[PDB]
Amino acid sequence: ALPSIQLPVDYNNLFNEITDFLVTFKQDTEKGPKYMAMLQKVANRELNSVIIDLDDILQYQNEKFLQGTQADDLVSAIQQNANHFTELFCRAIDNNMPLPTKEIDYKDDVLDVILNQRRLRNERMLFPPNLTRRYFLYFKPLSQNCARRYRKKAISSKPLSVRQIKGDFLGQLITVRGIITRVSDVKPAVEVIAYTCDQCGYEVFQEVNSRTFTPLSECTSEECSQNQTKGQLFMSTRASKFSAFQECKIQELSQQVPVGHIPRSLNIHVNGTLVRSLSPGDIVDVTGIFLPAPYTGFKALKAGLLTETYLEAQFVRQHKSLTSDVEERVMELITSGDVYNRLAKSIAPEIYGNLDVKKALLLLLVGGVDKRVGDGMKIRGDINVCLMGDPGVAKSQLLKAICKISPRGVYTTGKGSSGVGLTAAVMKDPVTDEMI
Amino acid sequence: DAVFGDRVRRFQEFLDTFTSYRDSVRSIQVYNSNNAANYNDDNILPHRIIISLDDLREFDRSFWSGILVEPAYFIPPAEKALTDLADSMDDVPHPNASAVSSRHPWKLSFKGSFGAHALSPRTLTAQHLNKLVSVEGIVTKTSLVRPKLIRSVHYAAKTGRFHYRDYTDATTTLTTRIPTPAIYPTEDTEGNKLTTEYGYSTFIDHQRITVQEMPEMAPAGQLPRSIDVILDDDLVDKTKPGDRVNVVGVFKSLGAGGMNQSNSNTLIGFKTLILGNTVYPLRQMLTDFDIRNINKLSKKKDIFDILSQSLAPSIYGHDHIKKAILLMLMGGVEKNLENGSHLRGDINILMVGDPSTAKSQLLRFVLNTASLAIATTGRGSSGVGLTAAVTTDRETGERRLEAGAMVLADRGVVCIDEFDKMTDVDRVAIHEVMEQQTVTIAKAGIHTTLNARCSVIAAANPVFGQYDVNRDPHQNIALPDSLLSRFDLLFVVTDDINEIRDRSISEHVLRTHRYLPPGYLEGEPVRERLNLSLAVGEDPKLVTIPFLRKYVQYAKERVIPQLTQEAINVIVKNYTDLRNDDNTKKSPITARTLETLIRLATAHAKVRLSKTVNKVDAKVAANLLRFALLGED
DNA sequence: TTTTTTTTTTTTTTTTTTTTTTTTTT
DNA sequence: AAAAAAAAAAAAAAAAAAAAAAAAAA
Ligand SMILES: Nc1ncnc2c1ncn2[C@@H]1O[C@H](COP(=O)(O)OP(=O)(O)OP(=O)(O)O)[C@@H](O)[C@H]1O
Ligand SMILES: Nc1ncnc2c1ncn2[C@@H]1O[C@H](COP(=O)(O)OP(=O)(O)OP(=O)(O)O)[C@@H](O)[C@H]1O
Numbered sequence A: 001a002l003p004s005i006q007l008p009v010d011y012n013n014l015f016n017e018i019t020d021f022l023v024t025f026k027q028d029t030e031k032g033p034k035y036m037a038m039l040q041k042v043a044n045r046e047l048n049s050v051i052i053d054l055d056d057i058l059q060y061q062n063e064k065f066l067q068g069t070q071a072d073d074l075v076s077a078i079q080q081n082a083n084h085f086t087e088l089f090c091r092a093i094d095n096n097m098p099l100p101t102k103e104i105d106y107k108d109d110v111l112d113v114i115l116n117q118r119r120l121r122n123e124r125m126l127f128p129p130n131l132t133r134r135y136f137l138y139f140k141p142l143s144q145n146c147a148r149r150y151r152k153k154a155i156s157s158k159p160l161s162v163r164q165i166k167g168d169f170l171g172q173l174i175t176v177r178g179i180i181t182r183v184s185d186v187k188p189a190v191e192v193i194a195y196t197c198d199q200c201g202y203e204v205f206q207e208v209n210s211r212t213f214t215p216l217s218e219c220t221s222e223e224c225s226q227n228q229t230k231g232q233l234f235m236s237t238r239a240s241k242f243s244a245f246q247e248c249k250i251q252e253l254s255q256q257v258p259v260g261h262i263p264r265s266l267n268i269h270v271n272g273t274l275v276r277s278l279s280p281g282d283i284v285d286v287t288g289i290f291l292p293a294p295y296t297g298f299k300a301l302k303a304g305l306l307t308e309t310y311l312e313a314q315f316v317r318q319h320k321s322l323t324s325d326v327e328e329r330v331m332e333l334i335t336s337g338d339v340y341n342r343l344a345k346s347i348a349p350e351i352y353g354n355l356d357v358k359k360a361l362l363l364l365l366v367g368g369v370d371k372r373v374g375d376g377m378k379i380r381g382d383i384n385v386c387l388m389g390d391p392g393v394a395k396s397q398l399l400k401a402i403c404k405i406s407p408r409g410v411y412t413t414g415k416g417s418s419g420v421g422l423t424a425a426v427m428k429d430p431v432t433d434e435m436i
Numbered sequence B: 001d002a003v004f005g006d007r008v009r010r011f012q013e014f015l016d017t018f019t020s021y022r023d024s025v026r027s028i029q030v031y032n033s034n035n036a037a038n039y040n041d042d043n044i045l046p047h048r049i050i051i052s053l054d055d056l057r058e059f060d061r062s063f064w065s066g067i068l069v070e071p072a073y074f075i076p077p078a079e080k081a082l083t084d085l086a087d088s089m090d091d092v093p094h095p096n097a098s099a100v101s102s103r104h105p106w107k108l109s110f111k112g113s114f115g116a117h118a119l120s121p122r123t124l125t126a127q128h129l130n131k132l133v134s135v136e137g138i139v140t141k142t143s144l145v146r147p148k149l150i151r152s153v154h155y156a157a158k159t160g161r162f163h164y165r166d167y168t169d170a171t172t173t174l175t176t177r178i179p180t181p182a183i184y185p186t187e188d189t190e191g192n193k194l195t196t197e198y199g200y201s202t203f204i205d206h207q208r209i210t211v212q213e214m215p216e217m218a219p220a221g222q223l224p225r226s227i228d229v230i231l232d233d234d235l236v237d238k239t240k241p242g243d244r245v246n247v248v249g250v251f252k253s254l255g256a257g258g259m260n261q262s263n264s265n266t267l268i269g270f271k272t273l274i275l276g277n278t279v280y281p282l283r284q285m286l287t288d289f290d291i292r293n294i295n296k297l298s299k300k301k302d303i304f305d306i307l308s309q310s311l312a313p314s315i316y317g318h319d320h321i322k323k324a325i326l327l328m329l330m331g332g333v334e335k336n337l338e339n340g341s342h343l344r345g346d347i348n349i350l351m352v353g354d355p356s357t358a359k360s361q362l363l364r365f366v367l368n369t370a371s372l373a374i375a376t377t378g379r380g381s382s383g384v385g386l387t388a389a390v391t392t393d394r395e396t397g398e399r400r401l402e403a404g405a406m407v408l409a410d411r412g413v414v415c416i417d418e419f420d421k422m423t424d425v426d427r428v429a430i431h432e433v434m435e436q437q438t439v440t441i442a443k444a445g446i447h448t449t450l451n452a453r454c455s456v457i458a459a460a461n462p463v464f465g466q467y468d469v470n471r472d473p474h475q476n477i478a479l480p481d482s483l484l485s486r487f488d489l490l491f492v493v494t495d496d497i498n499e500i501r502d503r504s505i506s507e508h509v510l511r512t513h514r515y516l517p518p519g520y521l522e523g524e525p526v527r528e529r530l531n532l533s534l535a536v537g538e539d540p541k542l543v544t545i546p547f548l549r550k551y552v553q554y555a556k557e558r559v560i561p562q563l564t565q566e567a568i569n570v571i572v573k574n575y576t577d578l579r580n581d582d583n584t585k586k587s588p589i590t591a592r593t594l595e596t597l598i599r600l601a602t603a604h605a606k607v608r609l610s611k612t613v614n615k616v617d618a619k620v621a622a623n624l625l626r627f628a629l630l631g632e633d
Numbered sequence C: 001t002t003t004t005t006t007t008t009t010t011t012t013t014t015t016t017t018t019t020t021t022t023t024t025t026t
Numbered sequence D: 001a002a003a004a005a006a007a008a009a010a011a012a013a014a015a016a017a018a019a020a021a022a023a024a025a026a
């Protein structure tokens, strides 16, 4: 049948150490445990996310080493395998959840009403725990500073590329540096599905751990055990638990591509409160778990043993107003004096000359009055500046440079691409094949 | 069974007979071991050795014959013995968290003489199946790298033990076995739920490349043929399209071949593939003798003249163009500047001239002598064929991009012939590549910027049959001004009738046409066929071409000169003198001439093997550009 | 005036593969 | 309860070649 192999890791001692770390850990630098404070904060319906730090876990390991008792190197176990430790930590959080200390505040929560209505009928006359959960659990990659402080090296936070991601890193926690190109809308993904049964017993719950599932449509309760054909199950959306899901694509930076090659791309999946952290056009450093997609359905047979892949995201590090500060900056620049000439001159300091052109580009940067006259008359305040002249006079640096100053600007060129008049009403977007 | 163990014993004896392989195993092992111990690191060598078939031939003729003739029954026994030896060497323990599950077995590679097993994608037939072969060719297409599952590990609740399932495929192993459905087990033998534990399983990278025959060796009236090679593990991404490669592997059949439930048909045959063991590129490593000779030849005063004259010794004259080509070979230093800009370091040359003036025989020479070169013809090219094309990956199913001529020659040269005969829609694309050195693709949901840093040498003809001196230069050249501004040196060459020139050039041509290759008799036709013997062993003064290639490589990779003030003083005076004069030049002078002087000075500085730009470099650049623009020679 | 030039307009799917999962049928 | 048979699952599309018009000029 299925042969058996011996592996060093045992999850019992790991669970014991997680339970010890949640209670014992204190920030050495409020007093007391670091995480039981934020758990109490969560219990008051205020915090929606729980973020664990592996620097903190190393701190607990270092405390135990100061005591001298052996440890299970939890930080390495998390790095090598992280899809199971999420469930372990969720169970550990569920076991030690503090009581609501203040402001219970039950107002109109449908799930709350359902759960409260369950109690009376069940007691007067076991469900999946994830239904009662609200917090989301994320890991935080290691820090080189803390690592160098205690050696031990580091692998999870190293800024790899899309190309350096081999098949040997699957099932681990790694970090990838790139630029975000495409981001999709937020849609709900089912986690626990509740079926209502023709006043037969009560609603049944099923968990979904894949991208594809099958409805139950058969009532198995004790009262529903009667033989008469009676009808299948109907889904109830209100008693079911959903989640926010988003998918993005990250592309390799031009600096890291070798000569003669084409850049690759990677897929990122994000669930929870971390959704909407990434937008198109951002250069970011994303940490997560690298997992194999099932690739099932059609065109799975031809591949046979070939799989897709994706990255479950858990952390985001983006590389890069009226206040008294900006109220004083303008006064400082006024006291500086020579605003006109200096403003014109500092525009593209590489190019020497054409100072009147630089004066005019300033006037183009500012806008004239747009006054809406009655009876339909309108007058424009925008500026139309054309610059003619012989080739090789710095024609096309001046322009590019002006685009930098104003955020709202587009550099459109000749017939290589059609963007000036592309006010088209048809868009064959591959995702859905409908017009935009 | 018994034969397997006997062959393992034979290979084990072979391994301790020759101690070199045992030393290489230890070197790799100690490197990998002491690399992981460097916590303050500044990467991992694969488990693969290269053995020579020759030594095995003297050791055991039977085993060598078995490997060459019946690889599928002699390679797996050898790999197990190599793994056993490697395991015996590693005395230090490695109680790693997850390396215990994945052993990464050692593999083998071959070299030496293959005899009659050295073939090409055309001479490979059904007689060579299940044999060890080597094929020479050019890579055309590659597939995307995907991960493939080899072993899955599952954890069982209520018991605490693990269970593993193994997977095999036709392309994975050399022996046919019962296939696997690649579905993860969900139920234990006792019915306990099983949970898949990624991070303990095994995945291997997989790629497929296509190798085509060299078009120069094809028979008359026939198109070149191609074959498919599958690469795995550590052989991935060692080749790129356009490369010339030699792949050693096992020629194998696959599938059912239409002898099955499907209808009987004469059009259905079997599918053939190669499981590559080794890939060899057909970078010239330099010894100390070569470097010492280069440094000794650098100090000679008239080195630029010798280097320029050594180019194309079968062309009479055209000294200045040959100097310009040499300066192209040793490009300038590229400067990365703020606002996301870069000053180009490439030198671009255009040649306009009369018919039969040896314009096209210099492009062919540049194709051969340079490290990377791509040939293009004006009328037989398209815009989508120069920048990139949207295609599909059959093996995996996505939509991808395929490189064109310009982007395939990154850090190389592109030689375009009949440049004026190119259509306008075609000529816009080359404009962008000449200006930004980048390609923008925004088609079919693929939004990408591609790097293309190539040097352009081009040849064209005037509007009429021959150059006219009684008409303005712009009337003679049909090319637009915007395109014409992007060339550093424009050379107008004219054939003038003179008796002494004719007497010399006719003598040179007649001397050239009377050359006999060594080993050929008079009247014996040249047998440019090689008789299917592709290779014997499978892996005033002028200078020889390979020495020139070594010189160019060393100069490009070892010296980066910087500009100096005293050279700038010469450059500025030359620029000011040239700008303010009434001489009628064949091309207008603009503010981009200064950059051309700087680039030519940098190239001449590289030629001298020096780290600074001197006054002599500025003088040489000035003389070259004065000849180009004026003809004052 | 009769030559050259120019946009531009359909051209596309007829086929595939062995699993995997369903209904009939002894 | 255990066999034999029968479908779903396609998707996709740019890139090039040939022919007839409706605007330009020695
Ligand atoms: N006043 C100036 N100051 C500095 N550099 C200048 C000046 N005028 C021209 N240049 C030079 O001109 C170049 C910038 O303009 P460039 O010739 O590239 O584009 P352009 O003027 O749009 O011409 P083209 O028609 O060739 O595209 C640089 O080499 C720059 O040094
Ligand atoms: N200077 C020369 N030395 C040696 N051979 C020459 C020379 N000039 C021309 N030839 C010979 O003239 C023939 C044609 O030359 P080639 O094809 O290079 O001309 P081209 O400039 O490309 O012509 P076209 O304008 O017709 O395209 C070749 O046989 C070449 O060897």
Ligand SMILES: [Mg+2]
Pocket: A395, A396
């Ligand atoms: Mg410009």
Ligand SMILES: [Mg+2]
Pocket: B359, B360, B417
């Ligand atoms: Mg020619």
Ligand SMILES: [Zn+2]
Pocket: A197, A198, A199, A200, A201, A219, A220, A221, A223, A224
């Ligand atoms: Zn019921």
